[PDB]
Amino acid sequence: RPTWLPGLNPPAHLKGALAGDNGFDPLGLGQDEGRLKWYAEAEKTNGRWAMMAVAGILGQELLGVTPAWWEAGAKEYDIPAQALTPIEFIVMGFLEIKRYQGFKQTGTSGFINSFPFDPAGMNSPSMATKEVKNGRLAMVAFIGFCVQALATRTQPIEGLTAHLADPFGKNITYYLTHLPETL
Amino acid sequence: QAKFFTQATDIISRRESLRALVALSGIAAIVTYGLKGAKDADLPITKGPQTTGENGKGGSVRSRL
Amino acid sequence: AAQGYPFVPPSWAPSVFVPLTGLVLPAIAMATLFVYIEKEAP
Amino acid sequence: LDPQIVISGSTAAFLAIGRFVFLGYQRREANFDSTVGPKTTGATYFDDLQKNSTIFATNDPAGFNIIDVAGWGALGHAVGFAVLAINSLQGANL
Amino acid sequence: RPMWYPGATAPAHLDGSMLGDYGFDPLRLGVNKDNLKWFREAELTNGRWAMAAVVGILFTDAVGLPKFWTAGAEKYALDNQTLALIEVAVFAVLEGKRYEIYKKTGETGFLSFAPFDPMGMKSEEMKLKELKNGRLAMLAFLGFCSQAAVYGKGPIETLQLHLADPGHNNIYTSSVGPETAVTVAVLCVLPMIIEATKTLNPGKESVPYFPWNEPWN
Amino acid sequence: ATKLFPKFSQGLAQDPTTRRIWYGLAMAHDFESHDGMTEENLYQKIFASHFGQLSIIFLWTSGNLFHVAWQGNFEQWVTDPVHIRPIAHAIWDPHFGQPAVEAFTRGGASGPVNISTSGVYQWWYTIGMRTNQDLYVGSVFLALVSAIFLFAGWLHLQPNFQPSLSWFKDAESRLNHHLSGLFGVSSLAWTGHLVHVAIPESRGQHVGWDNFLSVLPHPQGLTPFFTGNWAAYAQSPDTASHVFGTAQGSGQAILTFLGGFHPQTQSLWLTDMAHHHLAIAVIFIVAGHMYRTNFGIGHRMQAILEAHTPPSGSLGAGHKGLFDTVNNSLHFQLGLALASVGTITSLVAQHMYSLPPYAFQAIDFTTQAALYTHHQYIAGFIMCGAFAHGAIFFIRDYDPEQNKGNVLARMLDHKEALISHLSWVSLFLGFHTLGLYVHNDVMQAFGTPEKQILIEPVFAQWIQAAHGKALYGFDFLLSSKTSAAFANGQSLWLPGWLDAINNNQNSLFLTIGPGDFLVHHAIALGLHTTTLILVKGALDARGSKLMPDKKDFGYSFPCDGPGRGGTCDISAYDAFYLAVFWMLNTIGWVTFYWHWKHLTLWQGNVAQFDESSTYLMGWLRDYLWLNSSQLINGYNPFGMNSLSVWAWTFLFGHLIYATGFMFLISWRGYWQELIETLVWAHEKTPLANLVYWKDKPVALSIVQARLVGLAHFSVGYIFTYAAFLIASTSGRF
Numbered sequence A: 001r002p003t004w005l006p007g008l009n010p011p012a013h014l015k016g017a018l019a020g021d022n023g024f025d026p027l028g029l030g031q032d033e034g035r036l037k038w039y040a041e042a043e044k045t046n047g048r049w050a051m052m053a054v055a056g057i058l059g060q061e062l063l064g065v066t067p068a069w070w071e072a073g074a075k076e077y078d079i080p081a082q083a084l085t086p087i088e089f090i091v092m093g094f095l096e097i098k099r100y101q102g103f104k105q106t107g108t109s110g111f112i113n114s115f116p117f118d119p120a121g122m123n124s125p126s127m128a129t130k131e132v133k134n135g136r137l138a139m140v141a142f143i144g145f146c147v148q149a150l151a152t153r154t155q156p157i158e159g160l161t162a163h164l165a166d167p168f169g170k171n172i173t174y175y176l177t178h179l180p181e182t183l
Numbered sequence B: 001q002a003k004f005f006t007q008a009t010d011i012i013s014r015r016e017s018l019r020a021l022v023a024l025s026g027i028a029a030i031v032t033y034g035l036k037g038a039k040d041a042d043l044p045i046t047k048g049p050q051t052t053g054e055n056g057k058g059g060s061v062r063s064r065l
Numbered sequence C: 001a002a003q004g005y006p007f008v009p010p011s012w013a014p015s016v017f018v019p020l021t022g023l024v025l026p027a028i029a030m031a032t033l034f035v036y037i038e039k040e041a042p
Numbered sequence D: 001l002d003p004q005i006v007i008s009g010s011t012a013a014f015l016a017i018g019r020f021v022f023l024g025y026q027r028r029e030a031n032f033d034s035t036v037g038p039k040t041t042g043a044t045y046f047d048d049l050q051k052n053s054t055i056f057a058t059n060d061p062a063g064f065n066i067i068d069v070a071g072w073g074a075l076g077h078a079v080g081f082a083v084l085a086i087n088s089l090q091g092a093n094l
Numbered sequence E: 001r002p003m004w005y006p007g008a009t010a011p012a013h014l015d016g017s018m019l020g021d022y023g024f025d026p027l028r029l030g031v032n033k034d035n036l037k038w039f040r041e042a043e044l045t046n047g048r049w050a051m052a053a054v055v056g057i058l059f060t061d062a063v064g065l066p067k068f069w070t071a072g073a074e075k076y077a078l079d080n081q082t083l084a085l086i087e088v089a090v091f092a093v094l095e096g097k098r099y100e101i102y103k104k105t106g107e108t109g110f111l112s113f114a115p116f117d118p119m120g121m122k123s124e125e126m127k128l129k130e131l132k133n134g135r136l137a138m139l140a141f142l143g144f145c146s147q148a149a150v151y152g153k154g155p156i157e158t159l160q161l162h163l164a165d166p167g168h169n170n171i172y173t174s175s176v177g178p179e180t181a182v183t184v185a186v187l188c189v190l191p192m193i194i195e196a197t198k199t200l201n202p203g204k205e206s207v208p209y210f211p212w213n214e215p216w217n
Numbered sequence F: 001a002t003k004l005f006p007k008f009s010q011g012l013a014q015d016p017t018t019r020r021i022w023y024g025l026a027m028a029h030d031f032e033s034h035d036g037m038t039e040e041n042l043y044q045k046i047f048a049s050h051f052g053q054l055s056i057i058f059l060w061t062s063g064n065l066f067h068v069a070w071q072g073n074f075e076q077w078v079t080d081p082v083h084i085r086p087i088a089h090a091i092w093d094p095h096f097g098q099p100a101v102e103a104f105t106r107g108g109a110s111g112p113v114n115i116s117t118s119g120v121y122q123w124w125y126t127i128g129m130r131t132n133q134d135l136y137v138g139s140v141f142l143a144l145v146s147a148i149f150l151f152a153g154w155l156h157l158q159p160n161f162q163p164s165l166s167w168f169k170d171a172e173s174r175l176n177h178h179l180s181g182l183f184g185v186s187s188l189a190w191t192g193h194l195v196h197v198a199i200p201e202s203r204g205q206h207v208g209w210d211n212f213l214s215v216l217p218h219p220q221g222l223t224p225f226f227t228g229n230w231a232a233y234a235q236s237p238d239t240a241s242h243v244f245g246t247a248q249g250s251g252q253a254i255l256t257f258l259g260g261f262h263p264q265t266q267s268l269w270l271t272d273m274a275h276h277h278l279a280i281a282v283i284f285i286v287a288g289h290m291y292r293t294n295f296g297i298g299h300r301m302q303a304i305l306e307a308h309t310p311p312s313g314s315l316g317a318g319h320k321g322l323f324d325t326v327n328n329s330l331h332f333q334l335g336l337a338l339a340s341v342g343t344i345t346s347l348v349a350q351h352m353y354s355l356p357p358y359a360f361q362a363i364d365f366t367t368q369a370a371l372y373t374h375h376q377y378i379a380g381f382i383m384c385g386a387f388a389h390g391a392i393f394f395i396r397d398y399d400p401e402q403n404k405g406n407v408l409a410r411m412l413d414h415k416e417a418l419i420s421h422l423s424w425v426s427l428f429l430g431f432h433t434l435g436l437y438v439h440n441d442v443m444q445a446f447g448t449p450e451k452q453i454l455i456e457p458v459f460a461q462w463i464q465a466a467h468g469k470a471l472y473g474f475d476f477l478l479s480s481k482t483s484a485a486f487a488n489g490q491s492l493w494l495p496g497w498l499d500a501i502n503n504n505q506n507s508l509f510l511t512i513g514p515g516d517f518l519v520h521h522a523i524a525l526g527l528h529t530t531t532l533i534l535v536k537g538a539l540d541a542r543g544s545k546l547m548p549d550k551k552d553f554g555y556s557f558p559c560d561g562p563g564r565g566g567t568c569d570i571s572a573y574d575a576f577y578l579a580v581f582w583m584l585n586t587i588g589w590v591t592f593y594w595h596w597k598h599l600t601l602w603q604g605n606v607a608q609f610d611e612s613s614t615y616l617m618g619w620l621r622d623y624l625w626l627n628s629s630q631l632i633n634g635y636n637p638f639g640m641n642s643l644s645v646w647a648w649t650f651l652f653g654h655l656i657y658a659t660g661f662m663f664l665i666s667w668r669g670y671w672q673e674l675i676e677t678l679v680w681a682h683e684k685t686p687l688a689n690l691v692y693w694k695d696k697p698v699a700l701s702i703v704q705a706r707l708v709g710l711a712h713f714s715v716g717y718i719f720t721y722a723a724f725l726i727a728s729t730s731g732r733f
C-alpha cells in the first residue's frame, strides 16, 4: 500500500482492511481491537461534522450573510442563544442517543433507526474511502479555517482571493507578522 | 388503649418506614427551621448585627476594614 | 437565576445547608455506616 | 542580523554534525540491548503502547530517519534562536 | 417495551411486570418490592390528585376567578379553622378506608367499594392510561406552580404569553432560564454516561451506594 | 458472627470487637495488605484513588472560589487592597449571640464573616481576576474538571480501560510526558495566561474570553518572536510609578528581566513571572525529550543507572539493580515523591515570604504568617511520610538479593555509622544550643546581659553580602561594585534585586544576629534529630540486635513482648511516630522564629528580637506572653470581639493536645480492665442490659492509641498555633 512515508512499512495493527488505511499510526492508538472500532466511527463523525462545517462556512460566505462565520454566534436571531442551546441539546441528544444505540448493534453508522442510513444505493468500499478521505481533508481544512481567522482576520474564500492577489506577500509569513495591522 | 396505640404505629412499625418518617419529618423540621423557625426564635444570626460591626477595627495598629 | 452571573445561591441558602450539613447528612451517614458495620456476612 | 541566515546555519550545522559526526556515537549509545532489553512482555493494549508499533524506515544510507532529523533540527532551531536572542539585546557579558 | 431514553436497559427490579415500567429508577428507590407497591399506590394517588388539581386550576383560570396561589386567602362561608377541622375529620375515615383497601387489595378504593367501579370499565389498558395521564398531570401541576411562581399568571395566560413570542417568551428567557438550560443539557447528555456504565460493564448491574438501597449486598 | 464492613480484610470482618471498626478505617488505603490484591489491581486502585484525590482537590478550589465570589468582597477588595480585609466566607451559626454577630461583621459585610488568611484574594487579583463573575466562572470550571477526573477514575476502572501493570511500570514515557506536557507545556500555557490576561489586567486593560482574540499582548504581535528580535518584548517595562490594576505608568513589555519587587505591591513583577514560566517551559520541554519512547531515540533509565558504577566500587555495584528496585516498589517512589514535595514545599514557604509573588501580599501580614506556617507544617508532615514510606519499602518491597552490592544495600551495611553520626550531630547541637540559651538566660537573670554567648552568624551574613546586602560590609560579590558578578548583571536583574535586598522593610534577606544564629542551630538540631529518628526507623525497619526478625512482623506492629528486656515502640512505625513529635517541635521552632522576626519587623521593633531572642525567657515573655494579650482577651467577662473564635480555638487545641497525652502516657491494660468493669456494669444494670452491644467493647490497641494520641497531639498543636498566629497578627494588624 502507499504509506504516509516512502519506504515505510505499515504497522502490524493497521491491516489494509479498513477504509482510509495509509499505515498512519506513529503513536499506536489503534492497537486495541475495540478502541479502533470506536476511533473509526469517531473519525467518520468528526469528519462528517467537519465536512458539513466547511460546507456551511463556504456557503455562508458565498451567500450574503451579515457577519463572519466566527461572529455568527454573537448575532440576534429569532430565538436567543440561552434558549437555542437547550433545544439543540434535546434534538441532538435524541439523534445521537439513537445513533449510539445502533452502533452498539450492527456496529455501523446511521441516522435514527436505519442503520446504515443509505436511502440511495451508493454504498461501496470505494465510497467509504471517499468519505473518510474527504472527511480528513475537511477536518484539517476546518482547523485551517479556525486558525486562518484566529483574530479578526479574513474569511476563507476572502483569504483565498487575498492569497491569489499577492502570493509572495500574502502568506503565512505575512500574517504571522503584521498582526497589529490585522487588529 | 392497646388498639389505639397498636393502630397508631402500624404505618411505622417497620424499620425502613420509621426511618422514612424520621427522614421526612426531620428534613422538613430543619429546613423550615432554617426558613422560618430560626427567625421565629429570633436568633441573632437571623437578625443580623444591627450595627456597623467590627468593620473599621481590623487591627489595633492598622485599623483595616 | 439571579441577575448578573446566574447560579448565585439565595440569601436563605446558608440557613438551610448549614443545618443540613451538620444535622441531617451526618445523621443519614452515621446511620447508614452503622447498619453497614454491624451487618453480618451470610 | 537576518534571522533566516542564523537559524538556517544553526540547523544545517547541527544536522551536518548529526549525520556525519554524531551518528555513529548515537547509534552505539542508543543501542544498549545487553541487559536492558524490552520494556514489556505483555499482550494488552497498554503493553503495546510501549512497543515500537511504527518503525520509521528511511532510505538514507546511514539511517537518518525522521526522528533523527527532528531531534537534530530541534537542537539546531534552539541554538539558532538562542543566538538570535543573545544578539537581540545587542550585547554579551563574557 | 419502550424505555425512558432510547435503548435503555432497565434495572433488575423494573422488569416490566408493572405498568408504566419504562425502566426508570436511577436512584433505585424501588429495590424493595413492598416499597415498590407502596410507591405505585402513591404514584397513582399523587397523580389522581394532580389530575383533579390540574383540571381544577384550568377551570378556575379559564374564567374570571382568583388565581390558584391566592384562592386560599379569599373569604368563604366557613372559618379557616373549622374548614381544616372538618377536612381532617372526614379524611380520617376516607384515607383510613383507603389504606385498609390497600392493605387488603393492593389498589385504591373509596370507602368500601374496594374497586370504585360503578361503570365497570376497569382494565389494564385503562390502568395504564390512568397512570400515564397521572404522571403527565403531576408534571402539569408542577409546571402550573412553577410558571406561576416566575410570572404572576396561571396556566393559560402564560401559555398565551408563550404563544405570543415562542422564542422570546419561554423558560430560557425567564429568571429560571440558565439553570433549566444547563439542567436540560445535563439531562440530554446523561443517558450516554448511563449507557457507558451499561456498556463497559456488560450485563453487570451496579449498585449506586445509597442508604435506601442496602448496597452492601 | 462474621461481619461485612472490612470487605478488604476477612480477618477483621471476623473480629467480634470494636477493633474491627477502627482497623478497617485505618487499613482501607493499605491496598497491598488487602485480601485478594494483585500487583496490577493495586496499581489500578491507586490510579483511581489519584483520580479521586484530584477531583477532591479541584472541588476544594471550586469551593474556595465560590465562597469568595459569593460571601466575599473581592470586587471591593481590588479597589483598596491595603485597607480592606479579605473575606473567606460567611457564618451562619445558630449558636451565635447578638454580640458575636455584631463582632464577626467585618470587611464591609452585612453579616458575620471570616477574614481570609489564605491569600487567595491576592493570588486571584494578581493573575487577572477583578470580578466576582470571574471567580464564579472559575469555580464552575474547576467543578467540571473535578467531575471529569471523577468520571475518569470510574472509567479507568472498567475492564476495557483498566491499564496493564507494565503501563504503570513504564517510566520513560510517563517521565517524558510529565516533564514536557505536565510541567513545561503547563508553564507555557501559564505564560500565555500571564502575558495575555494577567499583565494587561495589571495594566488596567480588561482582557477576558470575549476579547483575548481581539486584543494584542504586545504592540508588535509576534513579529519580534518569529524574527528572533526577542528583546523587543522587554521594550517598555512597568515604571516605578506604576500602580497595580490601572494604566498609570503602565508599560508595554510582557517579558522583562527586571528583578526585585513592584514598588507599589511590594511583590514580584508579572512580566518577569511570564519570562520565568516561559524559560521554565522551554527547559522542561527540552528536558522531556530525554527518555526512550516508541520513536527509537532517547534514554533507557536502566542503562543510565547500570552505567553509573564508579571505578574502585566506592559505591559498590553502583546503581545496578536500582531500576527494578524503584519501578517495582511503590513505597520507594512514594518516598522519593514525598521527599521532593516536602522539600519544594519548604521552598515555597521560604521563598513566598521573601520573594512574595502576589500583589498586596507582604502588606497582609496575617496572610504571610498563615501561608508560611501552613506550608512549613505541610512540608514537615510530608517529609516524615517520606521516611515512613522508605521504611515500608525496606520491609515490604526491598529485595536484598536483587540489590546485591548496590548503594541501597551499602546503606544498610553501614547503617550504624549513619545512625551514630546523626546521633552525634543531634547531641552536639542540642547540648550546645541549649547550653548557650541557658547561659544567656542566666546572664539576663543575674542582670548581666553583656556576658551572653552572642555569636555573630558571619557565614550567613557573608552569603547575604555576596547577594548584595551592604549592611555588613564584606564587599564580596554583588555588594562589591567593582566586581564581575555585579558588572555583568547590571543591565539585568541586579538593580531591582539590590533595591529590594538593601531595603529593610521587606522580608528579602532579613538582617540577622546572634538570635538568628542560635535559632538556626536549634533548627539544625530539630532537623538532624528528626531525620535521626526517621533514618533509624527506616534502616532498623528490617532488623535490630533486639529483633533481627523485624521484617517478619510488618511495618506497624505493637511490640515483641516484655521479653529481652522490653520491646515497646520497637517497630519502624513507632520510630516515625516518635519522629512526628520532633518534627512538630522543629517546625514549631521554625515558625516561632519566623513569626517573631516578622512581628518585630512589621511593628518596626527588630531591636526587640535582636535583644530578646538570644535567651529563652525572651521567647516566652516577649513573644508568647506578650502577643497572647488580645488572643486570650478575645472573650472576657465584659464581652467579646472577633478574636473570640481564635481564643476558643486556642483553648481547643490546648484540650486536644492534652487529650492526646492520655493516649500517649496511659497504655492499654488499665483501660481494658476498666472496660471489663463497665461490661459487667452494663450486663448487670436493670433496664439497660436490655440494650447490648454487637461489637465487643475493647480498649484501643497499642498501635491504634499511639496513632490516636499522635493525632490529638498534632491537631491540638496545629490548632493552638494557628489560633495564636492568626489572632496575634490579626489583633495588631
Ligand code: CLA
Pocket: E136, E139, E140, E141, E142, E143, E144, E146, E147, E150, E158, E159, E161, E162, E169, E170, E171, E172, E174, E176, E180
Ligand atoms: C405538563 C407539561 C408542561 C407543558 C405542556 C409546559 C408548557 C409550557 N411551559 Mg411549563 N413547566 C412544566 C411543564 C410543562 N410546561 C414543568 C414541570 C415546569 C417546572 C420545571 C415548568 C416550568 C415552566 C416555566 C418556569 C416556564 C414554563 C413555560 C412554558 C411554555 C414554554 C415552554 C418553556 O419554556 O418551558 C419548557 C418547560 C420545561 C423545560 C419543563 C419540563 C417540561 C416537560 C419536559 C414536558 C414537556 C411537554 C411534554 C413533552 C408534552 C406535553 C403534553 C401536551 C400538553 C402536548 C409552555 C406553555 C415558560 C412560559 O410560558 O413563559 C412564557 C416559562 O417561563 N414552564
Ligand code: CLA
Pocket: F025, F026, F027, F028, F029, F030, F031, F334, F338, F381, F382, F383, F384, F385, F386, F388, F389, F392, F555, F556, F573, F576, F711, F715
Ligand atoms: C502522597 C501521600 C501519601 C500516600 C499515598 C500514602 C499512602 C499510604 N500510607 Mg503514608 N504517609 C504520608 C503520605 C502518604 N501516605 C505522610 C505524609 C505521612 C506522614 C504523616 C505518612 C505516614 C504513614 C505511616 C506511618 C503509615 C502510612 C501508611 C500508608 C498506607 C495506608 C494508609 C492508611 O492506613 O490509610 C488509613 C489512614 C487513616 C485513616 C489516617 C488516620 C487519620 C489521620 C491521622 C487524620 C486525623 C485528623 C483528624 C480527623 C482531624 C480532625 C480535625 C478536627 C478536630 C477539627 C498507604 C500506602 C501505612 C502503611 O502503609 O502501613 C504499612 C502506615 O503505617 N503512611
Ligand code: CLA
Pocket: F423, F424, F426, F427, F428, F429, F430, F431, F434, F525, F529, F532, F533, F578, F579, F581, F582
Ligand atoms: C524538653 C523535652 C525534650 C528534650 C530535652 C529532648 C532531648 C533529646 N531527645 Mg527528644 N523527645 C521528646 C522530648 C525531648 N527530647 C519527646 C516529647 C519525644 C517523643 C517521645 C522525643 C523523642 C525522641 C526520639 C525518638 C529521639 C530523641 C532524642 C533526643 C536527644 C537528642 C540529642 C540532643 O539534643 O542532645 C542534647 C541533650 C539535651 C539537650 C538534654 C540534656 C540536658 C542537659 C544538657 C543535661 C545535663 C543537665 C544537668 C547537668 C544534669 C542534672 C541532673 C542531676 C544532676 C539532677 C536528646 C536527649 C534522640 C536521641 O536520643 O538521639 C541522641 C532520638 O532518637 N527524642
Ligand SMILES: CCCCCCCCCCCCCCCCCC(=O)OC[C@H](CO[C@@H]1O[C@H](CO)[C@H](O)[C@H](O)[C@H]1O)OC(=O)CCCCCCCCCCCCCCCCC
Pocket: E075, E076, E077, E078, E090, E094, E110, E116
Ligand atoms: C371516587 C370519587 C370521589 C368523589 C367524592 C366527592 C367529591 C365532591 C367534591 C365537592 C363537590 C361539591 C360541588 C357541588 C356543586 C357546586 C357547584 C358550584 O357552583 O360551585 C361553586 C363553588 C364556589 O362557590 C363558592 O362557594 C363558597 C363556599 O363557601 C363560598 O360561599 C363562595 O362565596 C362561593 O363563590 O365552586 C367549588 O366550590 C368547587 C370546589 C370543588 C372542590 C372542593 C374541594 C374538594 C377537594 C377534595 C375532595 C374530597 C373528596 C372526598 C370528600 C367527599 C366524600 C363524599
Ligand SMILES: CC1=C(/C=C/C(C)=C/C=C/C(C)=C/C=C/C=C(C)/C=C/C=C(C)/C=C/C2=C(C)CCCC2(C)C)C(C)(C)CCC1
Pocket: F331, F332, F333, F334, F335, F336, F339, F343, F383, F386, F387, F389, F390, F391, F393, F535, F538
Ligand atoms: C528512607 C529512604 C527513603 C527516603 C529517604 C528520604 C526522604 C531522603 C530525603 C532526602 C532529602 C530531603 C534530601 C535533600 C537534599 C538536598 C540537596 C542535595 C540540596 C542541594 C543543593 C544544592 C546542590 C545547591 C546548589 C546551589 C546553591 C548552593 C545555592 C545557589 C544555587 C546552586 C544550584 C549553585 C526512600 C524512599 C528513598 C527509600 C530508601 C530510604
Ligand code: SF4
Pocket: F558, F559, F560, F561, F562, F566, F567, F568, F569, F667, F702
Ligand atoms: S507495648 Fe505494652 S505490652 Fe508491648 S512490650 Fe511495650 S509495654 Fe509491653
